[PDB]
Amino acid sequence: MEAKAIARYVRISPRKVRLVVDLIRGKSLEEARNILRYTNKRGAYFVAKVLESAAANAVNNHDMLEDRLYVKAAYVDEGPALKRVLPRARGRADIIKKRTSHITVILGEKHG
Amino acid sequence: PRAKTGVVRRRKHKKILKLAKGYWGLRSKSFRKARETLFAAGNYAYAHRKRRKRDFRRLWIVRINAACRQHGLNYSTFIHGLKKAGIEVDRKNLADLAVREPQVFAELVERAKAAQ
Amino acid sequence: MFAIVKTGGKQYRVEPGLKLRVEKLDAEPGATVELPVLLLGGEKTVVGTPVVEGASVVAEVLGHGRGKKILVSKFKAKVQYRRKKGHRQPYTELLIKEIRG
Amino acid sequence: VDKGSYLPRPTPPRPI
Amino acid sequence: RGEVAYSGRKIWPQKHTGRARHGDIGAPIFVGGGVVFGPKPRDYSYTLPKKV
Amino acid sequence: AKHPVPKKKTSKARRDARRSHHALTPPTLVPCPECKAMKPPHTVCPECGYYAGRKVLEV
Amino acid sequence: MKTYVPKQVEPRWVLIDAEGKTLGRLATKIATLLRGKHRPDWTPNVAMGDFVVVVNADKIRVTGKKLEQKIYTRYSGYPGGLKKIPLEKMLATHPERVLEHAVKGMLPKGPLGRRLFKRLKVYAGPDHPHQAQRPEKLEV
RNA sequence: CGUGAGGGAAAGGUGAAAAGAACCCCGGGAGGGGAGUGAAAUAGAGCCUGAAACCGUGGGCUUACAAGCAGUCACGGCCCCGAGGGGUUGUGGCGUGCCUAUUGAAGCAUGAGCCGGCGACUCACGGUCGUGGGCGAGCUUAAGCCGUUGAGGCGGAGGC
RNA sequence: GUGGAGCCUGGGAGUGAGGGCGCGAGCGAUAACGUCCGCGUCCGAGCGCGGGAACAACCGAGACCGCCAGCUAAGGCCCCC
RNA sequence: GGAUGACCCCAGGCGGUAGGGGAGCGUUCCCGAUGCCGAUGAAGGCCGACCCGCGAGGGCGGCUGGAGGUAAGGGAAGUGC
Ligand SMILES: [Mg+2]
Ligand SMILES: [Mg+2]
Ligand SMILES: [Mg+2]
Ligand SMILES: [Mg+2]
Ligand SMILES: [Mg+2]
Ligand SMILES: [Mg+2]
Ligand SMILES: [Mg+2]
Ligand SMILES: [Mg+2]
Ligand SMILES: [Mg+2]
Ligand SMILES: [Mg+2]
Ligand SMILES: [Mg+2]
Ligand SMILES: [Mg+2]
Ligand SMILES: [Mg+2]
Ligand SMILES: [Mg+2]
Ligand SMILES: [Mg+2]
Ligand SMILES: [Mg+2]
Ligand SMILES: [Mg+2]
Ligand SMILES: [Mg+2]
Ligand SMILES: [Mg+2]
Ligand SMILES: [Mg+2]
Ligand SMILES: [Mg+2]
Ligand SMILES: [Mg+2]
Ligand SMILES: [Mg+2]
Ligand SMILES: [Mg+2]
Ligand SMILES: [Mg+2]
Ligand SMILES: [Mg+2]
Ligand SMILES: [Mg+2]
Ligand SMILES: [Mg+2]
Ligand SMILES: [Mg+2]
Ligand SMILES: [Mg+2]
Ligand SMILES: [Mg+2]
Ligand SMILES: [Mg+2]
Ligand SMILES: [Mg+2]
Ligand SMILES: [Mg+2]
Ligand SMILES: [Mg+2]
Ligand SMILES: [Mg+2]
Ligand SMILES: [Mg+2]
Ligand SMILES: [Mg+2]
Ligand SMILES: [Mg+2]
Ligand SMILES: [Mg+2]
Ligand SMILES: [Mg+2]
Ligand SMILES: [Mg+2]
Ligand SMILES: [Mg+2]
Ligand SMILES: [Mg+2]
Ligand SMILES: [Mg+2]
Ligand SMILES: [Mg+2]
Ligand SMILES: [Mg+2]
Ligand SMILES: [Mg+2]
Ligand SMILES: [Mg+2]
Ligand SMILES: [Mg+2]
Ligand SMILES: [Mg+2]
Ligand SMILES: [Mg+2]
Ligand SMILES: [Mg+2]
Ligand SMILES: [Mg+2]
Ligand SMILES: [Mg+2]
Ligand SMILES: [Mg+2]
Ligand SMILES: [Mg+2]
Ligand SMILES: [Mg+2]
Ligand SMILES: [Mg+2]
Ligand SMILES: [Mg+2]
Ligand SMILES: [Mg+2]
Ligand SMILES: [Mg+2]
Ligand SMILES: [Mg+2]
Ligand SMILES: [Mg+2]
Ligand SMILES: [Mg+2]
Ligand SMILES: [Mg+2]
Ligand SMILES: [Mg+2]
Ligand SMILES: [Mg+2]
Ligand SMILES: [Mg+2]
Ligand SMILES: [Mg+2]
Ligand SMILES: [Mg+2]
Ligand SMILES: [Mg+2]
Ligand SMILES: [Mg+2]
Ligand SMILES: [Mg+2]
Ligand SMILES: [Mg+2]
Ligand SMILES: [Mg+2]
Ligand SMILES: [Mg+2]
Ligand SMILES: [Mg+2]
Ligand SMILES: [Mg+2]
Ligand SMILES: [Mg+2]
Ligand SMILES: [Mg+2]
Ligand SMILES: [Mg+2]
Ligand SMILES: [Mg+2]
Ligand SMILES: [Mg+2]
Ligand SMILES: [Mg+2]
Ligand SMILES: [Mg+2]
Ligand SMILES: [Mg+2]
Ligand SMILES: [Mg+2]
Ligand SMILES: [Mg+2]
Ligand SMILES: [Mg+2]
Ligand SMILES: [Mg+2]
Ligand SMILES: [Mg+2]
Ligand SMILES: [Mg+2]
Ligand SMILES: [Mg+2]
Ligand SMILES: [Mg+2]
Ligand SMILES: [Mg+2]
Ligand SMILES: [Mg+2]
Ligand SMILES: [Mg+2]
Ligand SMILES: [Mg+2]
Ligand SMILES: [Mg+2]
Ligand SMILES: [Mg+2]
Ligand SMILES: [Mg+2]
Ligand SMILES: [Mg+2]
Ligand SMILES: [Mg+2]
Ligand SMILES: [Mg+2]
Ligand SMILES: [Mg+2]
Ligand SMILES: [Mg+2]
Ligand SMILES: [Mg+2]
Ligand SMILES: [Mg+2]
Ligand SMILES: [Mg+2]
Ligand SMILES: [Mg+2]
Ligand SMILES: [Mg+2]
Ligand SMILES: [Mg+2]
Ligand SMILES: [Mg+2]
Ligand SMILES: [Mg+2]
Ligand SMILES: [Mg+2]
Ligand SMILES: [Mg+2]
Ligand SMILES: [Mg+2]
Ligand SMILES: [Mg+2]
Ligand SMILES: [Mg+2]
Ligand SMILES: [Mg+2]
Ligand SMILES: [Mg+2]
Ligand SMILES: [Mg+2]
Ligand SMILES: [Mg+2]
Ligand SMILES: [Mg+2]
Ligand SMILES: [Mg+2]
Ligand SMILES: [Mg+2]
Ligand SMILES: [Mg+2]
Ligand SMILES: [Mg+2]
Ligand SMILES: [Mg+2]
Ligand SMILES: [Mg+2]
Ligand SMILES: [Mg+2]
Ligand SMILES: [Mg+2]
Ligand SMILES: [Mg+2]
Ligand SMILES: [Mg+2]
Ligand SMILES: [Mg+2]
Ligand SMILES: [Mg+2]
Ligand SMILES: [Mg+2]
Ligand SMILES: [Mg+2]
Ligand SMILES: [Mg+2]
Ligand SMILES: [Mg+2]
Ligand SMILES: [Mg+2]
Ligand SMILES: [Mg+2]
Ligand SMILES: [Mg+2]
Ligand SMILES: [Mg+2]
Ligand SMILES: [Mg+2]
Ligand SMILES: [Mg+2]
Ligand SMILES: [Mg+2]
Ligand SMILES: [Mg+2]
Ligand SMILES: [Mg+2]
Ligand SMILES: [Mg+2]
Ligand SMILES: [Mg+2]
Ligand SMILES: [Mg+2]
Ligand SMILES: [Mg+2]
Ligand SMILES: [Mg+2]
Ligand SMILES: [Mg+2]
Ligand SMILES: [Mg+2]
Ligand SMILES: [Mg+2]
Ligand SMILES: [Mg+2]
Ligand SMILES: [Mg+2]
Ligand SMILES: [Mg+2]
Ligand SMILES: [Mg+2]
Ligand SMILES: [Mg+2]
Ligand SMILES: [Mg+2]
Ligand SMILES: [Mg+2]
Ligand SMILES: [Mg+2]
Ligand SMILES: [Mg+2]
Ligand SMILES: [Mg+2]
Ligand SMILES: [Mg+2]
Ligand SMILES: [Mg+2]
Ligand SMILES: [Mg+2]
Ligand SMILES: [Mg+2]
Ligand SMILES: [Mg+2]
Ligand SMILES: [Mg+2]
Ligand SMILES: [Mg+2]
Ligand SMILES: [Mg+2]
Ligand SMILES: [Mg+2]
Ligand SMILES: [Mg+2]
Ligand SMILES: [Mg+2]
Ligand SMILES: [Mg+2]
Ligand SMILES: [Mg+2]
Ligand SMILES: [Mg+2]
Ligand SMILES: [Mg+2]
Ligand SMILES: [Mg+2]
Ligand SMILES: [Mg+2]
Ligand SMILES: [Mg+2]
Ligand SMILES: [Mg+2]
Ligand SMILES: [Mg+2]
Ligand SMILES: [Mg+2]
Ligand SMILES: [Mg+2]
Ligand SMILES: [Mg+2]
Ligand SMILES: [Mg+2]
Ligand SMILES: [Mg+2]
Ligand SMILES: [Mg+2]
Ligand SMILES: [Mg+2]
Ligand SMILES: [Mg+2]
Ligand SMILES: [Mg+2]
Ligand SMILES: [Mg+2]
Ligand SMILES: [Mg+2]
Ligand SMILES: [Mg+2]
Ligand SMILES: [Mg+2]
Ligand SMILES: [Zn+2]
Structure with missing residues (x-):
């Protein structure tokens, strides 16, 4: 049995959160929590909420046991980009892409 | 009536990209680059179909030569002998005999020396 | 016990039981044909000059077919020359039945 | 040596 | 391209913009521009011989 | 200067090869001997407030 | 019928006394043995040739005035980094390299040719350390 | 956008019906997970279909002594499918992108980041030759008129 | 001499910057990957194939497709090959 | 050859830029259509190692999709990047 959570349209750039996500793929729910807590990155805040919500899903909806949960899968997909103007010199206007992430955490049960 | 592109171009591009599976980077992913790759690929195939006939004959000849010198003569002398004896077994079969049926190959070497 | 036969301008080592794909023969499926013999081998060794007189290799033509397609493609740069041709080679499939020494 | 200036x-x- | 609503102004200078050279945006090379040899209202009738 | 510029686009391979060193190193952590919680070493435990045997801080 | 392609065979070890033999004329044969083109089942895309052990490679012989005139050459990549070494001196300092260089140049370039080169074991002096493999004395 | 005359965009589609998701759970919210609606929910409103470039997760094969327009021909290994095929590629062989312009380009000469869509030999009238039919010392009507309302006739002025 | 010969009447063109090589001259310096004509050839358009290390025009030879068959051409046959 | 485009046989040609000629494929639309295919699934999309075609392409099959599509023969063009 698996349990998923997705945070869609989080305003952080995908390549950046993925760094944090990579840290907890395949980890126990317990280790992932400790890892995320002392990861000095903005993304850790977002990964944590998705992770903590999928846990809640597992326990509450899917008849899974907290003490057995581990991170079976996790990935970051790109959402639509917020496109903004960055004024450069000599009347030139650049476009900044303020990017977006769709963060998925999938939890399973480690038996035995 | 207006006859816009519609379906046609995409289908022609998939034709090509399908033929380019396995190619490196954009060569299997970009239609433009795939098409260029396939041009070269087709010319290579034509040319190498040709070269395969040569490539194999060379191998046969090398093998036949090794088997000849085991009986104290070289390929050129061997082939001349066979010609004088009127033995018309080709180099493909000769090389097979040279490896698989050494005693028969030995006999062929006999007739070879005897015909001169 | 094997023979080396000549069919379709090419030569092959054949043994009883062998299935051989060769150049298309003008013969009906199921029928049998006799292939020339250049050499016999195994126990007795007889050597053609070029073919051996008594011998023949009996073969039953299983049927006729076309080879899987080869794309023969021609291209010349800076000249807009491109040709695409589809080729399937005709063949005949044979069952080697016996060698007649 | 001074030559042209091409x-x-x-x-x-x-x-822009 | 002359029947299209756009202006006749040259959209940017001929040289030194680093862009392709263009004239007005009514040109058929532009999306939204005029069309080159599209249909114009015409009469398909023709006098077939009475005897025929 | 004369404004150096990339001569060719970097391939997916070549860009990703560059990033073969970009993986995070997980936080190094040790159990606090009092409350058994996981925290970085040589730091006052942020859960119970203990360090070097004594209560130091209000959590 | 398709052409025979051998399964991996136990390679043969071989011993050659280089003494008194002509450098290039010996090298030619050592290469052939290395390529295994003496074998009737030769295959160009695998190592199936012999292992060749050579002794008394310090007593290789050469014609003409090549002791003083043959130059072995090495470029280091640095400015003015072309070093020149005559035969005489190479024999005096690293005699096995003489026979090794000659043979190497008569092997194919590329990954396989490099492997075939490694199956060549050259020694100065009459003794070799590979009696364990029991190499078969060759007369060439 | 421009002082102004003036220039001038982009942007359509849930479902048959809002039945537009009560209520609970994690979350500050956004978002999601169950419950529920529906024939269908990767039809959930950022809504028909949902291609391509592009980014990612999982798996198979493969890669840290090797020389390159990236393929191709051969053989072997491994994985898959059920004397056969498909995927992968270790070694060996061969091998100078595409287009344009040129006497001559892989060319260190032009153009192109990549993908999708738009994008260039037409139409009228007259000519000339060919061709398919009609009539043939003749052939043919134009504007109009009548009729039809996707019906065809009349009309000889004129033209060859 | 029956040939993708030839002649006649029509329809449609493109081309009107050539280039290297051999031979015969001019110009040049009995220079030039020079220049300008003549005869021929090839490349152009055969940057398709073999040879010449590699290389449009030198040698060999005019590629409808297929074959894990045979003979040759130039060039080659000690090893790379 | 036989009766005439039925297919068989024998033979020869079949490198190709500018360019001339021929034969076809596909796109939109019209007649064929008050028809016919279609929720037992239209068009479009995504696969295929299968079939037919020299090729452009045409089928068939599985998934997707959810309401359109239109044959034999002809007609007309905003017809292939
Ligand atoms: Mg980060
Ligand atoms: Mg950290
Ligand atoms: Mg919980
Ligand atoms: Mg459940
Ligand atoms: Mg600034
Ligand atoms: Mg300013
Ligand atoms: Mg940007
Ligand atoms: Mg960016
Ligand atoms: Mg984004
Ligand atoms: Mg179209
Ligand atoms: Mg178009
Ligand atoms: Mg592909
Ligand atoms: Mg591949
Ligand atoms: Mg590539
Ligand atoms: Mg791609
Ligand atoms: Mg090709
Ligand atoms: Mg071929
Ligand atoms: Mg062959
Ligand atoms: Mg040949
Ligand atoms: Mg002969
Ligand atoms: Mg012969
Ligand atoms: Mg055996
Ligand atoms: Mg035959
Ligand atoms: Mg065959
Ligand atoms: Mg055949
Ligand atoms: Mg080909
Ligand atoms: Mg080109
Ligand atoms: Mg080329
Ligand atoms: Mg050209
Ligand atoms: Mg071309
Ligand atoms: Mg071209
Ligand atoms: Mg052209
Ligand atoms: Mg073509
Ligand atoms: Mg000057
Ligand atoms: Mg206007
Ligand atoms: Mg206006
Ligand atoms: Mg306007
Ligand atoms: Mg205007
Ligand atoms: Mg003006
Ligand atoms: Mg300019
Ligand atoms: Mg530019
Ligand atoms: Mg531009
Ligand atoms: Mg302009
Ligand atoms: Mg314009
Ligand atoms: Mg203008
Ligand atoms: Mg515009
Ligand atoms: Mg517009
Ligand atoms: Mg318009
Ligand atoms: Mg408009
Ligand atoms: Mg028009
Ligand atoms: Mg008309
Ligand atoms: Mg009319
Ligand atoms: Mg400065
Ligand atoms: Mg690049
Ligand atoms: Mg790129
Ligand atoms: Mg770059
Ligand atoms: Mg780079
Ligand atoms: Mg790439
Ligand atoms: Mg990647
Ligand atoms: Mg990555
Ligand atoms: Mg890099
Ligand atoms: Mg303490
Ligand atoms: Mg000697
Ligand atoms: Mg010797
Ligand atoms: Mg030997
Ligand atoms: Mg001597
Ligand atoms: Mg000397
Ligand atoms: Mg230096
Ligand atoms: Mg120095
Ligand atoms: Mg110096
Ligand atoms: Mg020096
Ligand atoms: Mg030095
Ligand atoms: Mg020094
Ligand atoms: Mg080589
Ligand atoms: Mg303003
Ligand atoms: Mg203003
Ligand atoms: Mg204003
Ligand atoms: Mg929409
Ligand atoms: Mg509605
Ligand atoms: Mg609706
Ligand atoms: Mg809350
Ligand atoms: Mg709460
Ligand atoms: Mg709450
Ligand atoms: Mg707040
Ligand atoms: Mg909510
Ligand atoms: Mg919900
Ligand atoms: Mg329901
Ligand atoms: Mg229901
Ligand atoms: Mg249904
Ligand atoms: Mg559902
Ligand atoms: Mg859902
Ligand atoms: Mg839907
Ligand atoms: Mg609808
Ligand atoms: Mg959708
Ligand atoms: Mg979507
Ligand atoms: Mg996609
Ligand atoms: Mg991808
Ligand atoms: Mg993976
Ligand atoms: Mg992967
Ligand atoms: Mg090394
Ligand atoms: Mg290695
Ligand atoms: Mg390599
Ligand atoms: Mg390699
Ligand atoms: Mg290369
Ligand atoms: Mg081979
Ligand atoms: Mg296989
Ligand atoms: Mg393979
Ligand atoms: Mg390779
Ligand atoms: Mg290779
Ligand atoms: Mg190449
Ligand atoms: Mg190479
Ligand atoms: Mg190259
Ligand atoms: Mg092209
Ligand atoms: Mg040019
Ligand atoms: Mg130019
Ligand atoms: Mg030029
Ligand atoms: Mg120029
Ligand atoms: Mg040149
Ligand atoms: Mg280059
Ligand atoms: Mg280039
Ligand atoms: Mg450059
Ligand atoms: Mg370059
Ligand atoms: Mg350039
Ligand atoms: Mg270039
Ligand atoms: Mg120019
Ligand atoms: Mg250009
Ligand atoms: Mg560019
Ligand atoms: Mg750009
Ligand atoms: Mg640009
Ligand atoms: Mg396009
Ligand atoms: Mg026209
Ligand atoms: Mg006309
Ligand atoms: Mg007419
Ligand atoms: Mg007529
Ligand atoms: Mg008529
Ligand atoms: Mg009349
Ligand atoms: Mg009326
Ligand atoms: Mg009516
Ligand atoms: Mg008139
Ligand atoms: Mg008159
Ligand atoms: Mg005659
Ligand atoms: Mg002609
Ligand atoms: Mg003619
Ligand atoms: Mg004439
Ligand atoms: Mg004429
Ligand atoms: Mg014309
Ligand atoms: Mg012209
Ligand atoms: Mg003129
Ligand atoms: Mg002129
Ligand atoms: Mg000129
Ligand atoms: Mg002129
Ligand atoms: Mg001139
Ligand atoms: Mg001239
Ligand atoms: Mg000429
Ligand atoms: Mg003179
Ligand atoms: Mg002189
Ligand atoms: Mg000249
Ligand atoms: Mg000269
Ligand atoms: Mg001269
Ligand atoms: Mg001439
Ligand atoms: Mg000439
Ligand atoms: Mg030209
Ligand atoms: Mg010619
Ligand atoms: Mg070249
Ligand atoms: Mg070549
Ligand atoms: Mg050549
Ligand atoms: Mg060459
Ligand atoms: Mg040539
Ligand atoms: Mg030249
Ligand atoms: Mg021919
Ligand atoms: Mg011969
Ligand atoms: Mg000769
Ligand atoms: Mg040579
Ligand atoms: Mg000789
Ligand atoms: Mg050899
Ligand atoms: Mg015929
Ligand atoms: Mg012809
Ligand atoms: Mg021909
Ligand atoms: Mg032709
Ligand atoms: Mg014609
Ligand atoms: Mg089409
Ligand atoms: Mg319709
Ligand atoms: Mg209708
Ligand atoms: Mg009705
Ligand atoms: Mg029905
Ligand atoms: Mg239904
Ligand atoms: Mg369905
Ligand atoms: Mg349609
Ligand atoms: Mg359609
Ligand atoms: Mg096909
Ligand atoms: Mg298809
Ligand atoms: Mg289907
Ligand atoms: Mg779907
Ligand atoms: Mg469908
Ligand atoms: Mg369905
Ligand atoms: Mg309806
Ligand atoms: Mg039709
Ligand atoms: Mg009709
Ligand atoms: Mg039709
Ligand atoms: Mg038209
Ligand atoms: Mg158009
Ligand atoms: Zn503590």
């Missing part, structure tokens, strides 16, 4: 003195442009 190019004008250059100056940078402005893309």
